Design a protein around this nucleic acid. Structure first.
Ligand code: NA
Ligand code: NA
Ligand code: NA
Ligand code: NA
Length: 331
DNA sequence: ATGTGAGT
DNA sequence: CAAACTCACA
């Protein structure tokens, strides 16, 4: 058990790095696609590949990748990948990409202009948009881990402010934090209200009222993006008078229809492996579960009509599963 | 009925 | 989990 391999990680590591190079250093979408699928199919392969020709029999694996595998099998390396690794251009592109807001397109532009380091970026803030400038301002903070006792404190300020606005609101911090992790890198809040449903007249101000109120108490300090259903921004714990100021953190807040809430909470509580195991069991029972709904499945293996859900428990009830605590949703 | 770049 | 989905901006 077993579970995943583990058996050809060296090959698949090579191909994924090659894909990332071609996607976002070269502008070569087809090469990127081909490496990605070749990596994915090899990763499923239950035997330790001993030649390029053995890999070649797989669909997705052609002559060029088979030859790269020989070189990598024979030597312990691929010269082509050692050169990419040593390449200043590609390394600079990948570093700049760590800034939230900067992606391959803006990274290519910046490196072509000689912008490669944080210091370089901190001297050319006029080349960046608001998202990227906020990404840069807090670059160090946004790579920092977030202790659990911090997440909890963050939890009951957004939970409390939301209540004092209107007790009808339901807000939940999901992600690994919900499933019990000793640290996260981000806070992921799911928000809803009884008179926003998938059939209703929308009412955009549900999300804005809570965002505004969190800025008002100085929890939210910056905005990366903000629409009628989705907010992404920055928050901070209140510092103690003077002394140590807490690092700034990424927080997302998402408004979801009431009749779709618990499927979202379920889906964004994870974990990824749990989720896969759960939708797999659902299929065994004749149900399909996604982030929005759970639907029965018909004789022809296809049906719909969302089932009523006002609880995580309800989803479990339908697939005849004992309710699983988030605390034990690792697998 | 804008297209792309990003982030999740 | 990739894919689709939001949102920002040129
Ligand atoms: Na990125
Ligand atoms: Na300048
Ligand atoms: Na999280
Ligand atoms: Na996240």
């Amino acid at each position: 058990k077993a579970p995943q391999e583990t058996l050809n990680g060296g090959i698949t590591d090579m191909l994924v790095e090659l894909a990332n190079f071609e996607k976002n250093v070269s502008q070569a979408i087809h090469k990127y696609n081909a490496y990605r699928k070749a990596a994915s199919v090899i990763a499923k392969y239950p035997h330790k590949i001993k030649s390029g020709a053995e890999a070649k029999k797989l669909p997705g694996v052609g002559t060029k990748i088979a030859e790269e595998i020989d070189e990598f099998l024979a030597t312990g390396k691929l010269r082509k990948l050692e050169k990419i690794r040593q390449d200043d251009t590609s390394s600079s592109i990948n570093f700049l990409t760590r800034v939230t807001g900067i992606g391959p397109s803006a990274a290519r532009k910046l490196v072509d202009e000689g912008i490669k380091t944080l210091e370089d970026l901190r001297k050319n803030e006029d080349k960046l948009n608001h998202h990227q400038r906020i990404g840069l301002k807090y670059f160090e903070d946004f790579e920092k881990r977030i202790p659990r006792e911090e997440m909890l404190q963050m939890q009951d300020i957004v939970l409390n402010e939301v209540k004092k606005l209107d007790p009808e609101y339901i807000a939940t911090v999901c992600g690994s934090f919900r499933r019990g992790a000793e640290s996260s890198g981000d806070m992921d809040v799911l928000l809803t209200h009884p008179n926003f449903t998938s059939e209703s007249s929308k009412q955009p101000k549900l999300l804005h009222r809570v965002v505004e109120q969190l800025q008002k108490v100085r929890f939210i300090t910056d905005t990366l993006s903000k629409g009628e259903t989705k907010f992404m921004g920055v928050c901070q714990l209140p510092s103690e008078n003077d002394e140590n100021e807490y690092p700034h953190r990424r927080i997302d807040i998402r408004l979801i229809p009431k009749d779709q809430y618990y499927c979202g909470v379920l889906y964004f509580t994870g974990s990824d492996i749990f989720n896969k195991n759960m939708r797999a069991h659902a299929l065994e029972k004749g149900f399909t579960i996604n982030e929005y709904t759970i639907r029965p499945l018909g004789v022809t293996g296809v049906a719909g009509e969302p089932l009523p859900v006002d609880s995580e428990q309800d989803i479990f009830d339908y697939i005849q599963w004992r309710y699983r605590e988030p605390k034990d949703r690792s697998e």
